Amino acid sequence: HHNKVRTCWNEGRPALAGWLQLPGTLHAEALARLDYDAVVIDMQASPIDFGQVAPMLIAIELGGAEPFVRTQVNDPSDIMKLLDAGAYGIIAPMVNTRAEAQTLASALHYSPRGLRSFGPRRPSLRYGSGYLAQASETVVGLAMIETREALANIDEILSVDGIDGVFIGPTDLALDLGHAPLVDTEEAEVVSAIAHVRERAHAAGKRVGIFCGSGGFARVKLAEGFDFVTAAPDLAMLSAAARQVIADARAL
Template sequence: MPNVLAELHGRLGRGETILNGWLHLPGGVSAEVMGHAGYDALTIDLQHGLIGEGGLVPTLQAMAATPAAPFVRVPGLHAPDLMRVLDAGAVGVICPMIDTPGQAAALVQACRYPPQGTRSFGPTRARLVHGDTYAARADAHTVVFAMIETAVALANLDAILDTPGLSGVYVGPGDLSLSLTGHATLDFRGGDVEEAVARIARATRQRGLIPGIFTQGGDLARAAMALGYRFVTAGSDFALLAGAARGVLGDLRAGTPTPSTSLY
């Protein structure tokens, strides 16, 4: 994975859009398939995915044979978890349910070395895969996303975005729509949810930060990019497999293929 930290940082700095794939399935093979398919980055989901902590490093190793940059969504705001995934070689972290500027500051602190933060030194696998100069480059190049997915976070958006050291925010449309409307959906087009999603992108870009979002791919990903999102998750291994299987079976049974409605 030579120079993947610098390459990703450079692309984001130039304002390019990063297409991210989402990994729920254990075993590492789907990471290889998704990485070789051409995703710019892949995110291991340790919050809702089926990849346990013991599967973290094998999945990162599978990813290392592909051009995709490795990200991890941690289970929650827990400093040891954040440090562990970075030490294992992730170039970026996505942390769920960040509702306040204090939580955003704690997230950044855990991901940055002193004096900027409180990350403990021990980049075991990170130094192996990113080189001996990793520690000197980590603070500048590691991507730290706070997830905006509740009405409380939306109310605190400006203060969260003003957190020093934060790379950007990442929208979870399922939880955000659930919090705003009482109904979880990934389709953010229309109503209060669309207005919120557009506002998040606009406020994030105004500060020179990176707006990210989860989509199922295709039309939703294009809609997100049109709003200015630059780190766009376009499908998960679980949902893509399920959708492809339904499509083949629907065609063979002479019915109309059923589109995926999975939140993942």
């Protein structure tokens, strides 16, 4: 009866999260049982549709991590349907303005404050009869910052009451700033924009998260005081692992 990520935050500790682009329940449960606080299912940059995400949410919860979803789009109806299938964290892409941040917030919180239509099939099964009274505490909402526009509007985005904070896509932001889409980019202008977003989030009493393609980059983001750090995509980790096995198999 607690959001493991919110528990980290209440204890003044960051959360570390997995990131899934591969559909299916077996790896979702296996990674959830590791020392991840949360596992993010990527519904944007992946072939994962609503039918495949539903059982993955169950597998992550059984594994003992907080099931999160990076949605395809910042659409209230998509977000609310995921919340009712038992997503306890939402990362909404392309939140560029305060109004888009307000749209995310609307989807996360019960009417009349939010417009979250009531029908909590899975949350009411997990939280029991105590759910409705603490329902907002059960869910984490992060607005994705991945554009020039979002960067310029960071303070108005952070001003929105009903979001926990923001989530940086460093490669997506590098590309929108006119740089190479390097995994775990350290391009100086992107490094500077990222540091600005983290400063403004902590200045507003809000959380800041970031996507990492490696354990090494995630270690640095944790040291820099990021509150929510993802590492690393299942497909990327599996492809790298297979490449290393083949090289060792084929070595003189």
